[PDB]
Paper text:
[name] ([name]) was isolated from a patient suffering from trichodysplasia spinulosa, a skin disease that can appear in severely immunocompromised patients. [name] has a 5232-nucleotide dsDNA genome encapsulated in its non-enveloped icosahedral capsid made up of the proteins [name], VP2 and VP3. As is typical for polyomaviruses, the [name] [name] monomer adopts the iconic jelly-roll fold with a conserved core comprising two β-sheets that are formed by strands B, I, D, G and C, H, E, F, respectively. We demonstrate here that the skin-tropic [name] binds sialylated glycans in a binding site formed by the BC2-loop on top of the [name] protein that is not utilized by any other structurally characterized member of the polyomavirus family.
Following cell attachment studies, we determined high-resolution X-ray structures of [name] [name] pentamers alone and in complex with glycans bearing α2,3- or α2,6-linked terminal Neu5Ac. For these experiments, [name] [name] was recombinantly expressed in E. coli. The [name] protein forms the characteristic homopentamer but cannot assemble further into viral capsids due to N- and C-terminal truncations of the expression construct. Extensive loops connect the strands on the top of the [name] pentamer and are named BC-, DE-, HI- and EF-loops according to the strands they connect. The long BC-loop folds into two different directions on top of the protein and is divided for clarity into BC1-loop, BC-linker and BC2-loop. The comparison of all seven structures reveals that [name] [name] does not differ drastically in its amino acid sequence, length and fold of the surface loops. The [name] [name] structure superposes on the BKPyV and JCPyV [name] structures with small root-mean-square deviation (RMSD) values of about 0.8 Å (calculated for Cα atoms of the [name] monomers). The groove forming the binding site for the terminal sialic acid in [name] of BKPyV and other polyomaviruses next to the HI-loop is still present on [name] [name]. With Y68 and L276, the equivalent region of [name] [name] is similarly hydrophobic. However, while the carboxylate group of Neu5Ac is recognized by two hydrogen bonds from side chains of residues S274 and T276 in BKPyV [name], similar interactions are not possible in [name] as the recognition of the sialic acid carboxylate group appears to be electrostatically hindered through residues D280 and D282.
Numbering used by the authors:
A (entry chain D): 33 to 40, 42 to 100, 107 to 302
B (entry chain E): 32 to 101, 108 to 302
C (entry chain A): 33 to 303
D (entry chain C): 34 to 303
E (entry chain B): 33 to 102, 108 to 303
Amino acid sequence: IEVLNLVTPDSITTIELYLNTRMGQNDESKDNYGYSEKVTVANSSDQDKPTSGEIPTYSTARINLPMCNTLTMWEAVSVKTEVVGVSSLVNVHMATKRMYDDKGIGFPVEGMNFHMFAVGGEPLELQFLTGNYRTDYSANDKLVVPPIKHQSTQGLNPHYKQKLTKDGAFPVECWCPDPSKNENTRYYGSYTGGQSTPPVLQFTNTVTTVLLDENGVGPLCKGDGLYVSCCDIVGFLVGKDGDMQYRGLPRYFNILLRKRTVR
Amino acid sequence: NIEVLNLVTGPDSITTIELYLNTRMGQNDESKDNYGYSEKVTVANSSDQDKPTSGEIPTYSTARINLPMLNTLTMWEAVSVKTEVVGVSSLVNVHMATKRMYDDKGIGFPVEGMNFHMFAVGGEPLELQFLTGNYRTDYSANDKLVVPPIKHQSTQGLNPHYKQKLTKDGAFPVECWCPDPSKNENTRYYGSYTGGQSTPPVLQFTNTVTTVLLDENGVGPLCKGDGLYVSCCDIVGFLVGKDGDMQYRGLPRYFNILLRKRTVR
Amino acid sequence: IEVLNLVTGPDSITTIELYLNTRMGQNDESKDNYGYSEKVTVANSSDQDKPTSGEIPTYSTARINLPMLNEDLTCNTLTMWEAVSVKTEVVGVSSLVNVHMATKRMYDDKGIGFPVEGMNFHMFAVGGEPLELQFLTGNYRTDYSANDKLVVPPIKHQSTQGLNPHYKQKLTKDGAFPVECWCPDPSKNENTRYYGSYTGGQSTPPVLQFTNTVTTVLLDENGVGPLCKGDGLYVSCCDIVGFLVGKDGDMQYRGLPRYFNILLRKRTVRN
Amino acid sequence: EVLNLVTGPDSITTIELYLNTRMGQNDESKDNYGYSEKVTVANSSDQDKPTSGEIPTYSTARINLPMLNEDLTCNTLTMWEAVSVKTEVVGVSSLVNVHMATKRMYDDKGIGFPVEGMNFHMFAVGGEPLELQFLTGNYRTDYSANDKLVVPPIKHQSTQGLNPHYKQKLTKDGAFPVECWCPDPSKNENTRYYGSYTGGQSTPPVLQFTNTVTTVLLDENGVGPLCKGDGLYVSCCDIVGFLVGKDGDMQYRGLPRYFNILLRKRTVRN
Amino acid sequence: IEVLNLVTGPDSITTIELYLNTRMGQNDESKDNYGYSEKVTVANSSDQDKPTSGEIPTYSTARINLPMLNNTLTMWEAVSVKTEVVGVSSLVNVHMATKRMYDDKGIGFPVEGMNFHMFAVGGEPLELQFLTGNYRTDYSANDKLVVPPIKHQSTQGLNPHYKQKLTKDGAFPVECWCPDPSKNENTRYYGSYTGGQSTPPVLQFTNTVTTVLLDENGVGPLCKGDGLYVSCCDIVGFLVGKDGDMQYRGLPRYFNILLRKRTVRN
């Protein structure tokens, strides 16, 4: 894309949406919504076959935007995004393991934190990379995973790529953003690991993230499509008998766009 | 919402509002023992028998302040705020009747664990979204708590049919209500959470920090019907009794707000 | 105080240096355990919470006399000293590099002695009048009568576990106001700046910095610093860096001294 | 001796690449790739001889830049000057996995231990090999279980601090151990390197990934690494922690790194 | 000193480059425990607190002679420093003979616990204040340690009668000497402490960071008698032996200091 000038009233527009988490029980009408199923643990690396619904996936959505030598496209300028329902973590009376010889608080949701989001003019481009090349994903055929398995995929093998084109379908554990592509998408992410680690979270409606690149060009919405993706894991819920489930929270986006002429 | 015009200049164009809010950890009566704490935390046997006891549930603190009464109108516009947690030094106390370190010879455990700190300033009540860790939580032990009368599975995620307004102090549980980011155009909120079991509280206090409430366009919260809305929650951790029983501990918050006159269409 | 212009000329600025030693409970520099509290005790119940004499940290404070400015106190204008900035440091942080003291030790009595560790509390204030204090405690019933030299309210009440504005005081005495029940009153202190932090937990690593290259500006949003009433400069602080854990597990607060280097200038005020 | 920039079309160029991790099992056709072999522990400091493949090494590559063909007999020459780099750790999301054959929490009912503990992250971009200084926690370490490792031929007590007679250049991928080689601060004028270490036993890994951060490689004089012989040197190590096996066996886990480097032509004195 | 104009033009700037090796207690580079302390011992009681020889960390320091320079005189003025801790990557080693995780199947304990990092650059020796956690500490197992000749209860606080200047490498214990903030007008110092028992070390290394040494008036340390003084300490934790015995580990530090010629009144 050769980028021409901005169109100088009716030349900007806002898009609001939220994405609900995809931890593994992704049916809103059922119990454990917004959690994974019970986490299971492989007996050996060649019997690493997770149960259905115990694997978190990326959340994603495509939004439709309004529709010579010169053409106009929607340019994404900025985004205010925030994690919703952080305060739901101020809860230590649920049916959980508890502190101090069954006299103290219930363990709050705690441990692993993974927070990512992305905004672009096309689906987020993915790279396959996993901790265990032999992971068998066939307990849930709705997951999108490569048809073949190889030793090299525990590192970066560029023959194993994909595009985030489906909500609740791409496991975060084997797909990450492809840094060699995504020239038309902006992505930001963090991971805090460990076993019982304190979640450290913020929420405010005053923070704006500029999506313009180093030349003042935001993501350009191809075929007038805006692509928004995320994942937000805030820890594990610890059951009374020590069984554990991922907990994730939803994400909100407020995206400002403008009109931009291209060649 | 409101079509904004020019600022009013000259004398009497500025005013100030100073207040504090007391914590609402669950025992909220200032003449009862345990004021500024929750009652003892209890733990449900299963997720369909999740009924907290009366008073073990932290709620939001909030107040509405009447401001001076004043083609076009004039409204009070909130410009900035100096806000601080009060009584941080009270947590330097290890001689209370608590569990203690090192084979009963060491210090009392200080108040420690979960920290949750939020405050909001707006020209109307804080707009809320329901979201909970357990859609079945039964709040009927305390009929003063404001919660939805219908329980649904989808409220463990974001369901936008479950909204509310923060219009009563000491009644909206923090655990099920958060700021609605899809509204709150006329309010600024700021919040954080540090979890874990016995996590160190990390706290700061000073009278030298000003939070600017002006938005990207240089427009602060505009005070509808001459009302200013201030809300907060400040959990600093848990007090651990001798037998392991635990109570939330909260601290008060101070606000000093600067407001100016703004002309609107 | 109605504030006017700065006074210029070669006598317009002055500098004040001092340090304040810690007041952890054992506050006599000729005695053992100086710079620590006495052994911490633990109440049997909340209505028998009576700390032992010397187990309680208090604020360090001092009033410094400044050069006299006004001989005639019947003029339309007067001059006051105005605190512009302060360079302050915690002294002796390197002392915490010590794992050979008589302490509990790691790894079945073969490892290091526990270093001083746990709760940290750091605050300092510079003002032109005493730091104004608000009473707030974790236990309204706390009985201070083991040490009648502590300054505390004469009445107790449930409401003091929150903010009761009828329970206030001024920091007018070194080593006497307990940290656990007095904090800076944010509804006053118009003429003092304070800065404070707390890091809790049981065995928490202390995290401390020391340098001679950082200046804290004390001017407010309008460019006005603390104005020294009666030509008096008030400096206050507390610096708790953790607990020393004795061989049997008894524990003491440890504190460190603080240094202050303050720049002041002359300012004209209405009289 | 640096002079001014040159103008015109093709005064600029970009180089894009990634480097895979070198934790010990460095063969992409075999199991445990991207991990070390199980860590083993010496019985005494005079018998400290690690097994082959349990030892992390630096990743590195020389990249050929478009050739600057020119008369070598004149007053000036032209060099490629690295201006800036966008670099990120790839696959961070792979650490969101608690179902692998690992030790697990809460009396064998909870999650599998995620990859956790020691984190070591460095990258370097230069116009010649990264210059290395030898420094080890044990001077007696015996690397002779793997003769591919590049280490000094003699051992001396002084190598537990800085002995400047023990230096190297980082000229082979997967060969220079991290544990005994660090960047030499007394040289490397023509390289920029960045590093960090978070230690401890089971420490939460803290990681970020984005495509929006540029690292300026120009020094305080506005001069970037200058690529000798039209060669660009890129180096890294990204240890994200240990995998804990069911029985307590532990392996390093590392992750690949991406680089996108901007370079411009600069005139230098000949 | 009354500072006047800078000296301009050629040979008005110079650079100084050095490193300082750590002084953790075993400070003899030909011996096996170099760059560590001897094993830490723990006193039976505070009145019997006599550390063994070699288990005490001390400051590293050096004086560098600058080129001969000289109503008015010329002095060297330190403008900035680039400094880094060297050999951080050496802490990526969990196969040494040490205590280990998970019932003797897991990693060796890495070097961990207490971190203390400080450096100083000035035009005269760094001025010290005595302050200790235990006034009775008996240092006579090593009479090469420079400590006060007299002891008193008040030295667990700040007693300004107990001062020194950092004039010897590997001799002033870190546990009882700190920078004196009432002096050091002609030195810049920077330090941090992270304590705890087994705390993760958090360390950074880079050749791209410059520390400006000029004060608020644009004046850096002025090198009296053409002497530049550099001091540091870099403790990175403890090595835990198989039986639980522990020793301090330190790392060396590099400095690259830029100086300029400054005219001053005499």
